[PDB]
Amino acid sequence: TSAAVTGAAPPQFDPIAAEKGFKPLHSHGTLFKIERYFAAAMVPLIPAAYFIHGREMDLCLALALTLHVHWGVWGVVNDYGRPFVLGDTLAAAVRVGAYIFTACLLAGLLYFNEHDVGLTRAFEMVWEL
Amino acid sequence: KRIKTFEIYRFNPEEPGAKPKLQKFDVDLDKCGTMVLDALIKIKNEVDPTLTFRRSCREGICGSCAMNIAGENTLACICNIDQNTSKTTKIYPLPHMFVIKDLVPDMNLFYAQYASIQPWLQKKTKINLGEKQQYQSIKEQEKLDGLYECILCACCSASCPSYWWNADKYLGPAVLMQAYRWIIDSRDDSAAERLARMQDGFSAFKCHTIMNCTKTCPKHLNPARAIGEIKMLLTKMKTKPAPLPTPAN
Amino acid sequence: EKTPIQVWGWDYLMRQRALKRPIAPHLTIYKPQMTWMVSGLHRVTGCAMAGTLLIGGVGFSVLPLDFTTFVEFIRGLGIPWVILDTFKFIIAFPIAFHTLNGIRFIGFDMAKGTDIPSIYRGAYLVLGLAALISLAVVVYPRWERHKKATLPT
Amino acid sequence: AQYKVIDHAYDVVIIGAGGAGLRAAMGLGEAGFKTAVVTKMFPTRSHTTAAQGGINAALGSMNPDDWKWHFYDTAKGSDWLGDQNAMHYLTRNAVEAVTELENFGMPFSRTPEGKIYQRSFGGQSNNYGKGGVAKRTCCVADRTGHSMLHTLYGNSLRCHCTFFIEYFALDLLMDKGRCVGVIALCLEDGTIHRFRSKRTIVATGGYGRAYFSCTTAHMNTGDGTALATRAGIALEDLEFIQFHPTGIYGVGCLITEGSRGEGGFLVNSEGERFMERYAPKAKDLASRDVVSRAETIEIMEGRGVGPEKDHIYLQLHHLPAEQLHQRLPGISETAKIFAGVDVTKEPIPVIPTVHYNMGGIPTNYKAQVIKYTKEGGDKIVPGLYACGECACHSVHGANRLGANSLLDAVVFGRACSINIKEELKPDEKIPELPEGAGEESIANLDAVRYANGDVPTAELRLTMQKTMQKHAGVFRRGDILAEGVKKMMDLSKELKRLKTTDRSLIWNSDLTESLELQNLMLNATQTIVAAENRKESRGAHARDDFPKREDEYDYSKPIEGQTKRPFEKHWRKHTLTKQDPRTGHITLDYRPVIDKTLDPAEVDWIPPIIRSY
Numbered sequence A: 001t002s003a004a005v006t007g008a009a010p011p012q013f014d015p016i017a018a019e020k021g022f023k024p025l026h027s028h029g030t031l032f033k034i035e036r037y038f039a040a041a042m043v044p045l046i047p048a049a050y051f052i053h054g055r056e057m058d059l060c061l062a063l064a065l066t067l068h069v070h071w072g073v074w075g076v077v078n079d080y081g082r083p084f085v086l087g088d089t090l091a092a093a094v095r096v097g098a099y100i101f102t103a104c105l106l107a108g109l110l111y112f113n114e115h116d117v118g119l120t121r122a123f124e125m126v127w128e129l
Numbered sequence B: 001k002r003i004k005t006f007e008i009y010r011f012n013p014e015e016p017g018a019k020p021k022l023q024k025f026d027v028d029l030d031k032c033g034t035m036v037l038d039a040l041i042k043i044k045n046e047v048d049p050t051l052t053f054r055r056s057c058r059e060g061i062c063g064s065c066a067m068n069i070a071g072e073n074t075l076a077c078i079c080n081i082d083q084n085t086s087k088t089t090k091i092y093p094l095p096h097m098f099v100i101k102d103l104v105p106d107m108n109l110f111y112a113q114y115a116s117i118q119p120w121l122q123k124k125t126k127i128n129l130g131e132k133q134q135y136q137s138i139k140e141q142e143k144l145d146g147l148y149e150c151i152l153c154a155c156c157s158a159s160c161p162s163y164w165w166n167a168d169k170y171l172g173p174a175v176l177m178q179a180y181r182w183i184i185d186s187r188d189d190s191a192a193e194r195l196a197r198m199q200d201g202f203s204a205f206k207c208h209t210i211m212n213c214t215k216t217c218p219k220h221l222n223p224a225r226a227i228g229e230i231k232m233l234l235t236k237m238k239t240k241p242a243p244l245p246t247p248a249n
Numbered sequence C: 001e002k003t004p005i006q007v008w009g010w011d012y013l014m015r016q017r018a019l020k021r022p023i024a025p026h027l028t029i030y031k032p033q034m035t036w037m038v039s040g041l042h043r044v045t046g047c048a049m050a051g052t053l054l055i056g057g058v059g060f061s062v063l064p065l066d067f068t069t070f071v072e073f074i075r076g077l078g079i080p081w082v083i084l085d086t087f088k089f090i091i092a093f094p095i096a097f098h099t100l101n102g103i104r105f106i107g108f109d110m111a112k113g114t115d116i117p118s119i120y121r122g123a124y125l126v127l128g129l130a131a132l133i134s135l136a137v138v139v140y141p142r143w144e145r146h147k148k149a150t151l152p153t
Numbered sequence D: 001a002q003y004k005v006i007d008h009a010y011d012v013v014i015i016g017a018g019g020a021g022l023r024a025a026m027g028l029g030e031a032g033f034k035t036a037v038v039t040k041m042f043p044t045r046s047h048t049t050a051a052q053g054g055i056n057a058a059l060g061s062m063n064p065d066d067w068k069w070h071f072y073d074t075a076k077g078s079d080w081l082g083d084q085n086a087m088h089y090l091t092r093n094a095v096e097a098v099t100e101l102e103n104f105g106m107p108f109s110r111t112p113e114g115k116i117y118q119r120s121f122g123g124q125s126n127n128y129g130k131g132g133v134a135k136r137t138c139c140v141a142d143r144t145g146h147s148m149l150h151t152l153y154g155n156s157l158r159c160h161c162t163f164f165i166e167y168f169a170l171d172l173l174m175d176k177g178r179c180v181g182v183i184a185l186c187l188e189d190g191t192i193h194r195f196r197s198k199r200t201i202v203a204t205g206g207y208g209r210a211y212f213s214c215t216t217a218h219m220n221t222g223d224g225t226a227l228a229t230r231a232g233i234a235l236e237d238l239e240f241i242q243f244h245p246t247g248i249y250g251v252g253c254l255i256t257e258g259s260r261g262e263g264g265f266l267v268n269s270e271g272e273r274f275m276e277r278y279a280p281k282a283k284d285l286a287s288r289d290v291v292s293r294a295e296t297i298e299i300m301e302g303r304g305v306g307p308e309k310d311h312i313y314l315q316l317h318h319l320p321a322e323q324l325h326q327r328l329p330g331i332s333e334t335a336k337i338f339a340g341v342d343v344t345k346e347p348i349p350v351i352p353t354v355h356y357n358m359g360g361i362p363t364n365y366k367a368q369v370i371k372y373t374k375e376g377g378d379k380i381v382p383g384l385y386a387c388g389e390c391a392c393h394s395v396h397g398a399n400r401l402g403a404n405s406l407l408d409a410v411v412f413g414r415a416c417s418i419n420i421k422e423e424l425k426p427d428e429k430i431p432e433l434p435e436g437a438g439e440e441s442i443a444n445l446d447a448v449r450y451a452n453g454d455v456p457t458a459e460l461r462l463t464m465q466k467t468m469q470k471h472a473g474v475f476r477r478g479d480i481l482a483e484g485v486k487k488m489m490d491l492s493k494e495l496k497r498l499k500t501t502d503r504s505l506i507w508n509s510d511l512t513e514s515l516e517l518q519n520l521m522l523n524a525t526q527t528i529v530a531a532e533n534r535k536e537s538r539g540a541h542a543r544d545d546f547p548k549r550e551d552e553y554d555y556s557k558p559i560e561g562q563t564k565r566p567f568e569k570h571w572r573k574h575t576l577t578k579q580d581p582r583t584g585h586i587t588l589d590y591r592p593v594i595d596k597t598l599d600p601a602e603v604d605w606i607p608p609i610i611r612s613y
């Protein structure tokens, strides 16, 4: 039989009509322009670290490393933490955990330079066995 | 007689819960043409007609044969078979695509994503559709070089692991590069808003700059170069309008 | 807040799943290359460093066992220098590399140096300049720790 | 077996996403219609994308032209089998049509003063055939047809033409001489779709794949000309199968005729520009029907080149590499990739290859399909148009002119959407379908799908293509052809001994290619029988036993008091092959070539002369 249901037009996108109601401008641009410029200003920082040492470097190594890495592991976590394969709630939960990563690393570093040897006297020590 | 041995993704969707098996074919390089596609039509006609895939042009121009030959995304049609018969060349459909069948990936996403970028000419005041040629000096239109040729084969895209992972939200190399082609068309006034469409953190900026896409393009274009230039538009530097239709025009 | 297309994008992914259709083999089957693997290494280093900075950072706070005990509870079964001078190399390289490749990636972000020759140069002149510095930073002060082992005058 | 059917109802349904295909869609959508567009491949994959040399228009960005000189060379190229009304549309409009592309967005290559760059091409000249050689060909450098298809495609998205990609047009929806829609196999899920629509338009391109060797794509099996043969329509001029001069010796993929309009030329065994002898003034820029015959003789007479003395060289290596970049970029490569040739240091292996099909479904100047008994003229078939390669307004007649074809899709594709924004009144609602509407369409699909038999879908084609190539070649004789048509026709039986294997629906490439063969046989046959009967020599078609061009007079002796030859005994007339697809036999008839212009007041009917380039 050619005796069966009337069908529907196939799922297709419609660039114009789907344009009408949805016009926000939330440009991630400006934020991105900085965190490159930041890793671009992290450059002279890292060879100065081979050279200048002590508790004053230590601080702002760990202070600047934090900021790069917070963004970094956000970047990472937004990739692999696909809402498709993870489902919505468990994907907020890797996204929350990514500030819990950031915040922690710091407590851990801050502490390290305060009640252990600091990073610059660590990287001395290991380089001596 | 040297017998080259192929290994090709098979999926049968009609069969009840079927798993994707990798199939083994030998083919006589003596009674078969130079490219891989040649060998694929050989094995369909001669061995096994169920071996299903997409093909046209046959001259490197449509992009319907895009698939994954010996690890890389490239055009089966202009792909030389590995002349070394002791190796064993093996073929897969564009990575992280939903396979309808055998070698035929559900392209529809990739296609819709195209449609997004509004891939026609647009101007700030209406113009008479059948009237005069908008001026574009030779130097302006050299900017579209590297850009219009894209056959939309989706090799790049299906090679960019960004796209594999977040295809929903990341436009992905092929598709972006085209959008750029519309923002530096010295004749297109939508530069402004056409950039506004891909401002957010995923659709555009999800290029973690891997470069896989330019390496795999069979048409030897360069999608990264564009993406780059787009990042520059989303942040610092500008599109620059054309010198006016110098009169007698 | 999804843009018109990505809404649609999501819906597609829903269909494509409901259809029980499988996913075309990717990293399993995609050939090793100097593009992605550079990046991937840039990934691994990036994380693995910050990885350390957590299990290290916090690691030592929330433990007894301070870092100066840890240097001795290793030098206490001191293994021949070469072994050790490789852990030096491993520890240095990740920084050596991720920084090199870093400046690099930014270039790519700025459209600059995005052609396949000047790309592959990139990959080498970085992967090179790293492995070189990393050894020259582990091996050079293992030098003035031997030139001092026997003082000629 | 058991199948699943769907219904839609559209204003206009277009079976093709070609250049013709999409220009219709997009004028028709922007005019405001419920447009469905149905294509067995994704629209950037359509053959139009292969187009290389470009598109004809008198824009004079190089040197003052008149749209009329283009009309001229077009009638010339037509070998007076070409309806001049049709060509009048083609040429006046071309000036605008092309310009419209630039306004759409086609990255036309540029003059220093930013006008569309124009190359020379094969078969065109200024001054009503009495100037120099023309620069009237428009081109995105080298791969023009691609840029136009992607442009025409881009714009197809703005006009809401809900696209039906990867569905296979099976047959027309026929109810007493009027077309109500199509019926399609959906590839992606083996379901069947019934398109109730007020009109239908068939833009399926040519049938080059009916040959062993063609420049065309694997998909050019001309399913359109089947769909309409199978809906009882009679086809015309099938026998006019342009062989392109410059197809790559081995694999058979077009090197542009553009290569010649930039200064490349043909070279024999002893390497002398052997057209400086076959066509003194036009030379290597003669019409293709005459250059490809010119080539073929040099072969049979041993002046060939290669290890075999059976193809010739196309030499480009003299031209400055700085012009081979910008003017011929895309074939510097498609030569390097397939024939090992660095086009700046050696010549290119080229043999004539089946290329374009003037032939198609009969249409009036408005692109509407026609039935025609000797008696009551040519009666319109309502609800049905067709355009492009696949159509036969014969804007081409016996020989296609270079670069006319993309124009002939853009132009008439556009002349569907203009001529339908005409006589479709916002009342006449969506036609209802007959009971059992193409149940016989699907019954064929089934027959084919489970086709047990003993001859593979594969093999059968192979032997058809091989005969078809031997028997319907450049030069045809009554002995070759007559046995051909006998072989061929024993084959159109073997379809009842046909053999599939892929039993399934969802993407069944084995089964579509068997459908594609089924069609291509109805194509193959009607072609060669027309060509066997044509006792003349005009255009692409050329007989070794009827070497004179046979017209209603003789246009060497200045006509003055000649009695007109009678319509039966001369061949300046169209060929309507009419086949019932069941039995599979053909019976001919002949429409008269339409000689008058669209508006005699604007320009004059250009009357038959000596076909000499």
Ligand SMILES: *Cc1cc2c(cc1C)nc1c(=O)[nH]c(=O)nc-1n2C[C@H](O)[C@H](O)[C@H](O)COP(=O)(O)OP(=O)(O)OC[C@H]1O[C@@H](n2cnc3c(N)ncnc32)[C@H](O)[C@@H]1O
Pocket: D015, D016, D017, D018, D019, D020, D021, D038, D039, D040, D041, D042, D043, D046, D047, D048, D049, D050, D051, D052, D053, D054, D055, D144, D145, D167, D168, D169, D170, D203, D204, D205, D206, D215, D216, D217, D222, D223, D224, D254, D355, D356, D387, D388, D389, D390, D402, D403, D404, D405, D406, D407, D409
């Ligand atoms: C073959 C060729 C032609 C060509 C050329 C180079 C090559 C290799 N270069 C040209 C040039 O430089 N200048 C020019 O004027 N013409 C040139 N040509 C000729 C020209 O490209 C073509 O003859 C013409 O453009 C064809 O376009 P058209 O729109 O008429 O048709 P198409 O693009 O070939 O594609 C046909 C469409 O129809 C659909 N189709 C076909 N059958 C079916 C069925 N079974 N079911 C559903 N859809 C069907 C196809 O999907 C396609 O979209």
Ligand code: HEM
Pocket: A036, A039, A040, A042, A043, A044, A046, A065, A068, A069, A071, A072, A073, A075, A076, B208, B209, C039, C042, C043, C044, C045, C046, C047, C049, C050, C053, C095, C098, C099, C101, C102, C103, C105, C106
């Ligand atoms: C001058 C020094 C550095 C520069 C210029 C730099 C540069 C970059 C750049 C451009 C990215 C791009 C983000 C992306 O591809 O998504 C990145 C990623 C990242 N970086 Fe750095 N980096 C530097 C040092 C470091 C260090 C020392 C660490 C470890 C503490 C680190 C941790 C990360 C992490 C976790 C990412 C996430 C993205 C990925 O792995 O691909 N970075 N870096």
Ligand SMILES: COc1[nH]c(=O)c(C(=O)[C@@H](C)C[C@H](C)[C@@H](Cl)CCl)c(O)c1OC
Pocket: A079, B161, B162, B165, B208, B209, B210, C027, C036, C037, C039, C040, C041, C043, C044
């Ligand atoms: C952009 O950075 C990236 N770079 C890559 O090499 C990449 C990949 O190709 C992955 C196979 C490598 C990735 C880091 C691993 Cl460890 C996931 Cl199991 C990848 O998925 C990726 O994220 C999109």
Ligand code: SF4
Pocket: B063, B149, B150, B151, B152, B153, B154, B155, B156, B157, B173, B174, B177, B216, B217, B218, B219, B220, B221, B223
């Ligand atoms: S960028 Fe290259 S590989 Fe990708 S769709 Fe375009 S032509 Fe294909």
Ligand code: F3S
Pocket: B159, B160, B161, B162, B163, B172, B173, B206, B207, B208, B209, B210, B211, B212, B213, B214, B223, B224, B227
């Ligand atoms: S591979 Fe993807 S990461 Fe950017 S460089 Fe190409 S789009």
Ligand code: FES
Pocket: B037, B054, B055, B056, B057, B058, B059, B060, B061, B062, B063, B064, B065, B066, B075, B076, B077, B078
């Ligand atoms: S089929 Fe056209 S690209 Fe291979």
